Design a protein around this ligand. Structure first.
Ligand SMILES: [Ca+2]
Length: 765
């Protein structure tokens, strides 16, 4: 019933261990009411290890890198006074995790009172009780100040996790004495600027002063610049209850006002909070779990599951007004006709996540894909031919590579009626790019194996879209070019097995065709981004069949996969060639299904996600969080990859718009998308006795794992809708059609699935 209570929003909120936020937020909500720690923070604005909090920001990005995105509109409660633009140091309040409470839709904290004037502001007796909650587009605040205090709220419009580009504030005092503030914030993250409009109203009478770029605190009711803000001052009589309501719109201030009225009306703070909690319980309730003591003796695995399901519904964010409109990259307002438009993409990192969303919430997935299509269609409509990074985006956003694979994923899964797909296509083609004349002749990018395999997958994705558009010859060409990276860059005998077997591996190759020297296990060798050749070797997951053949045959692949996971030396951390910390080879644990050893896939799925494993690689060159260098743990570390702890992931292991969380959910369900852009999922090791996915029409997918335990993680046999089942993959249609997939589990590896019908490969389809 109350799934919300199982979510721990503090998981991954410490230091460099996930870069997630405890922010109050609704499912796929635009408004993200995040506490802000000081002097340290994680990328979202909050580091669990800190002991001071300034205030609450209203925009954000989940699990991203750099110094984080969003972080706009900082609201700081204070008993102090200002005569100039506030020093950010004066915002700091002591806090304790003992006086802090948060969950789906809400966050509460007891803040140490602060008082004084300007730079003399410091600790003062009493507590500012802070409560926030969130609706899709709105953040609501309720504060209690110590009796006798002159309550104040600073609205700081300079604050951003990366870069403030411009901001404005306009002040209105209404007949009842309450104040409304409105304007725009323009920020930047990674590739692009974005603009959001806001309205914020007090629920009690207030006076107001504003500041602009000259740091002067004045009575003027308008500011427009870069560093701007407002300071609200309330009557001491209202100390016991100070309320604020903030609403965001990518469209305009007037739309934000309309949204606030529709979304919040005259509802109380508690009602808004309760409603979002009910919305989370509906969302999380899409998956119902029965977890025995055998498999989850502490109850922590179930809590881990629902925490990560919660994280799965964060990005992309709802970027649609209550009037069914959105802002295009052309800078204009358009209709989201008969669907909700979502925006905020990090597709280079997160592309596999959508394949999972597809089987948990089909309708949400469809709207996401339709949105992605509109985004590229809008780019094309500008007629500039420019890439997406040259426009101002409607919400904070990241990057768009692999978009063709995501759209292809929906098409392959049987989704249709994607309006404006024909418009999206040429823009998707520009995103993917073309090999140069010389690259077309030789079949690859010289010295750049990474860019080559990436284009391979992009072109496969594009070939699916092309056929859907009736562009038959173009799809053929795309498929031909998509086969090149496997064929031309898999160097025969790059690694030699213990028995002499010659194993082909992804290797940089020169323009003239000679192979370039590389260490296949070295982080970022050969021009690679955030990985090794062993890891990028499996990248072209749309053609495992051709890859197996290029590697030197079935036995070569089988032995390569075992070497990949250090099976010959299970107690040597240096033998672990797979990385758990990054998304590059996320699919690797499930590739044993393709080499005739499904039991090893089962072992690794259960181990990585629910046990301690050997970890050799971090997600970046070095980390101050753990002894590390050259992209590795130095020494390799035996540890849990996922923890029910503020240190939630491995150090450096960013969640990346909920990707790592989504893969945890997929591992638990036991169905993993090795081939994004296909309709298939690979069978892993389902964690729970019973997992039921209920769809909107009342039908349900049910996967059972009879006798599953911490020790019994191997499949012994299986049935599908009552009949003997021996494949290690299942089609999307089977899942959403509401099948009953029943596994019998055991403590020893079995030969179940060793006679599987072949999974999808482009070359053999
Ligand atoms: Ca990453």
């Amino acid at each position: 019933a109350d799934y919300a209570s199982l979510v721990d929003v503090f998981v991954g909120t410490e230091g460099d261990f996930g870069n997630d936020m405890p922010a109050a937020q609704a499912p796929n909500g635009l408004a993200k009411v995040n506490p802000r720690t000081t002097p340290g923070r994680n990328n979202t604005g909050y580091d669990y290890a800190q002991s001071k909090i300034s205030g609450f920001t209203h925009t954000n990005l989940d699990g991203v890198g750099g110094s984080g995105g969003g972080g706009d509109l900082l609201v700081v409660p204070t008993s102090g006074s200002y005569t100039a633009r506030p020093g950010t140091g004066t915002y700091a309040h002591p806090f304790s995790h003992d006086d802090e409470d948060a969950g789906p839709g809400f966050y509460s904290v007891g803040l140490g009172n602060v008082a004084g004037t300007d730079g003399a502001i410091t600790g003062a007796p009493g507590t500012i009780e802070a409560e926030v909650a969130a609706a899709t587009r709105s953040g609501v605040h309720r504060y209690a100040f110590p009796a006798g205090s002159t309550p104040s709220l600073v609205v700081d419009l300079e604050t951003n996790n990366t870069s403030r580009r411009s901001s404005s504030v306009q002040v209105e005092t209404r007949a009842d004495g309450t104040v409304e503030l409105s304007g725009q914030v323009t920020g930047y993250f990674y590739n692009a600027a974005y603009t959001l409009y806001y309205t914020a109203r007090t629920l009690q009478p207030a006076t107001v002063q504003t500041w602009g770029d000259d740091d002067r605190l004045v009575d003027a009711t308008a500011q427009d610049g870069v560093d701007t803000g407002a300071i609200l001052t309330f009557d001491p009589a209202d100390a016991g209850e100070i309320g604020l309501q903030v609403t965001l719109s990518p469209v305009s201030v007037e739309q934000a006002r309309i949204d606030q009225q529709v979304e919040l009306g005259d509802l109380s703070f508690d009602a808004i909070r309760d409603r979002t909690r009910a919305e989370w319980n509906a969302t999380l309730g899409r998956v119902a779990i029965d977890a025995s003591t055998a498999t989850d003796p502490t109850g922590e695995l179930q809590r881990l599951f629902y925490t990560h399901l919660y994280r799965m519904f964060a990005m992309p964010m709802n970027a649609t007004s209550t009037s069914g409109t959105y802002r295009g990259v052309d800078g204009a307002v358009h209709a989201a006709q008969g669907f909700t438009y979502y925006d905020s993409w990090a597709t280079w990192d997160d592309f596999r996540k959508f394949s999972v969303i597809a089987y948990i919430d089909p309708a949400l997935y469809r709207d996401m894909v339709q949105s992605l299509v509109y985004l590229f269609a809008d780019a094309e409509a500008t007629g500039t031919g420019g890439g997406l990074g040259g426009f101002v985006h409607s919400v904070p956003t990241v990057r768009w590579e692999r978009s063709s694979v995501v759209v292809a994923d929906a098409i392959a899964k049987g989704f249709d009626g994607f309006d404006r797909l024909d418009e999206a296509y040429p823009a998707l083609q520009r995103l993917v790019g073309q090999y140069s004349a010389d690259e077309l002749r030789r079949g690859y990018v010289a010295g750049n194996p990474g860019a080559s395999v990436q284009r391979g997958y992009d072109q496969y994705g594009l070939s699916v879209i092309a056929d859907e558009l009736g562009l038959t010859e173009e799809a053929e060409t795309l498929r031909e070019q998509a086969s090149w990276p496997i064929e031309k860059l898999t160097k025969p005998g790059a690694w030699t097995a213990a028995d002499g077997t010659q194993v082909g591996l992804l290797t940089p190759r020169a323009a003239d065709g000679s192979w370039q020297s590389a260490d296949h296990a070295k982080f970022e060798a050969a021009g690679l981004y955030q990985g090794t050749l062993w890891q990028y070797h499996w990248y072209d997951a749309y053609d495992m069949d051709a890859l197996v053949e290029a590697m030197g045959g079935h036995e070569a692949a089988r032995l390569g996969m075992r070497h990949m996971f250090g099976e010959h030396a299970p107690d040597d951390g240096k033998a672990m060639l797979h990385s758990n910390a990054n998304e590059i080879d996320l699919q690797a644990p499930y590739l044993f299904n393709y080499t005739g050893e499904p039991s090893l896939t089962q072992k690794w799925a259960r181990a990585i996600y629910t046990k301690e494993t050997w970890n050799r690689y971090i997600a970046t060159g070095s980390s101050s969080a753990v002894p590390s260098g050259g992209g590795e743990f130095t020494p390799p570390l035996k540890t849990k990859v996922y923890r029910l702890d503020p240190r939630g992931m491995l150090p450096t292991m960013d969640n990346d718009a909920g990707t790592m969380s989504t893969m945890f959910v997929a591992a638990a369900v036991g169905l993993f998308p090795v081939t994004a852009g296909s309709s298939q999922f690979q069978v892993g090791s389902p964690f729970f006795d019973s997992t039921t996915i209920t769809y909107d029409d009342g039908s349900a997918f049910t996967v059972t794992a009879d006798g599953v335990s911490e020790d019994a993680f191997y499949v012994q046999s299986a049935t599908l809708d009552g009949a003997t089942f021996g494949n290690t993959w299942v089609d999307y249609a089977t899942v959403v059609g509401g099948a009953d997939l029943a596994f019998r589990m055991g403590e020893q590896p079995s030969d179940w699935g060793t006679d599987t019908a072949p999974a999808f490969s482009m070359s053999t389809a």
